[PDB]
Amino acid sequence: QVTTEAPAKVVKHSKKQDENIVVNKFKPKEPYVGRCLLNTKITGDDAPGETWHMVFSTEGEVPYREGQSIGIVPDGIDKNGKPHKLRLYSIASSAIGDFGDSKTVSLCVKRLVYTNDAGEVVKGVCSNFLCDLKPGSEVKITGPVGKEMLMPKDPNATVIMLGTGTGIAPFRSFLWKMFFEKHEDYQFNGLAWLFLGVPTSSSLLYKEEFEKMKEKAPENFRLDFAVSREQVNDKGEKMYIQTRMAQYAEELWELLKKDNTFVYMCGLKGMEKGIDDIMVSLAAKDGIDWIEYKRTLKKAEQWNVEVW
Numbered sequence: 418q419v420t421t422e423a424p425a426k427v428v429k430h431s432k433k434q435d436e437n438i439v440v441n442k443f444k445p446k447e448p449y450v451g452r453c454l455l456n457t458k459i460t461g462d463d464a465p466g467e468t469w470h471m472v473f474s475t476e477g478e479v480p481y482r483e484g485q486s487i488g489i490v491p492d493g494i495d496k497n498g499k500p501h502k503l504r505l506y507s508i509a510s511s512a513i514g515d516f517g518d519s520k521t522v523s524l525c526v527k528r529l530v531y532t533n534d535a536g537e538v539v540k541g542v543c544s545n546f547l548c549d550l551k552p553g554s555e556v557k558i559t560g561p562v563g564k565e566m567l568m569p570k571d572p573n574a575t576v577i578m579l580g581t582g583t584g585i586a587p588f589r590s591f592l593w594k595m596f597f598e599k600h601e602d603y604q605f606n607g608l609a610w611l612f613l614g615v616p617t618s619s620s621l622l623y624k625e626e627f628e629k630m631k632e633k634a635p636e637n638f639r640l641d642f643a644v645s646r647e648q649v650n651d652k653g654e655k656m657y658i659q660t661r662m663a664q665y666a667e668e669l670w671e672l673l674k675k676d677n678t679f680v681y682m683c684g685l686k687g688m689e690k691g692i693d694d695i696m697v698s699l700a701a702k703d704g705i706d707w708i709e710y711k712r713t714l715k716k717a718e719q720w721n722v723e724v725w
């Protein structure tokens with residue numbers, strides 16, 4: 418008698434792809450050092466700001482999956498002569514990545530530039546270090562990190578994706594896996610519906626990639642852009658992400674009632690309310706309380722949010 422079945426720890430059931438998930442492999446103390454293979458501006462010269470897509474080599478060292486983030490420890494020192502604290506960035510590439518070999522990682526980085534009260538133009542530390550990275554240079558990477566935006570296991574589920582600006586990053590990751598890759602253990606066949614809000618057309622992130630997936634899966638991939646400074650509804654209101662969702666209020670409410678519908682929200686801290694505003698009205702008209710309904714959705718792993 419050499420064996421025993423040690424009693425199992427009690428565990429919550431999960432609908433998301435967390436099987437053998439990896440978080441916090443590399444710490445800022447000793448980050449994985451990769452290199453920059455390419456770094457391109459993906460917004461027009463005309464856009465209000467600059468967003469860049471960049472790919473780093475990882476030689477397979479960083480075991481990330483769709484929906485996770487990696488931290489970056491930007492080179493240099495702060496005003497006190499101290500090395501910089503890491504900043505987190507949602508991975509914009511699928512687990513197999515942009516080269517199909519499972520040895521790289523991609524980011525979608527908005528260059529932060531503003532002017533303080535004093536009137537001085539200020540440059541965010543990490544965002545400007547990253548957008549200025551030249552192919553060949555090293556970059557310090559930490560993580561992976563995150564379990565909140567992991568994709569649902571069900572390959573026939575409906576995945577509604579709501580993102581603003583760079584919040585599109587984990588959705589580019591999910592979609593490459595769903596429409597640009599043939600996975601033996603995962604072939605997607607549900608409905609993938611993407612809503613992206615950006616300020617101008619020159620600001621539309623990965624439009625062309627999204628347009629190829631639509632051309633490749635015209636049935637089950639739906640794409641809706643919400644260009645706030647160029648589009649307007651019948652009332653002349655700026656087309657924000659929730660203003661565009663409102664044009665499909667009936668259909669979305671119906672899917673929200675299906676049990677295999679998972680909703681993901683990523684991007685600006687504020688997008689959150691406009692959406693809830695849109696939701697309460699719908700549920701209301703159906704004699705349902707969004708407050709209560711939302712709770713269930715969240716506990717049911719169907720209303721996933723990651724905003725900054």
Ligand SMILES: Cc1cc2nc3c(=O)[nH]c(=O)nc-3n(C[C@H](O)[C@H](O)[C@H](O)COP(=O)(O)OP(=O)(O)OC[C@H]3O[C@@H](n4cnc5c(N)ncnc54)[C@H](O)[C@@H]3O)c2cc1C
Nearest residue numbers: 504505506507525526527529531541542543544583586725
């Ligand atoms: C989980 C997670 C995922 C993220 N994903 C991404 C991503 O994919 N892409 C991306 O670009 N960002 C992402 N971020 C944000 C990112 O981590 C950094 O916060 C961002 O890049 C700015 O950092 P920085 O080092 O450039 O700026 P910092 O040097 O840290 O400066 C930021 C500070 O400047 C001030 N500030 C910022 N904006 C303004 C403004 N408009 N006016 C006045 N003061 C201001 C604030 O005090 C702020 O704390 C994510 C954040 C989190 C938490």
Ligand SMILES: NC(=O)c1ccc[n+]([C@@H]2O[C@H](COP(=O)([O-])OP(=O)(O)OC[C@H]3O[C@@H](n4cnc5c(N)ncnc54)[C@H](OP(=O)(O)O)[C@@H]3O)[C@@H](O)[C@H]2O)c1
Nearest residue numbers: 507581582583584614615616645684685687688723724725
């Ligand atoms: N995992 C994460 O947590 C994660 C990942 C990626 C990014 N982010 C965060 O999300 C943000 C994306 O930054 P970004 O500069 O790329 O955004 P952005 O370019 O400034 O604008 C995004 C769009 O959202 C609009 N918008 C503003 N307020 C809104 C609201 N209340 N509801 C709906 N839409 C609204 C803007 O319209 P107007 O300009 O006309 O107002 C604009 O069209 C960053 O702050 C970043 O920190 C977080």
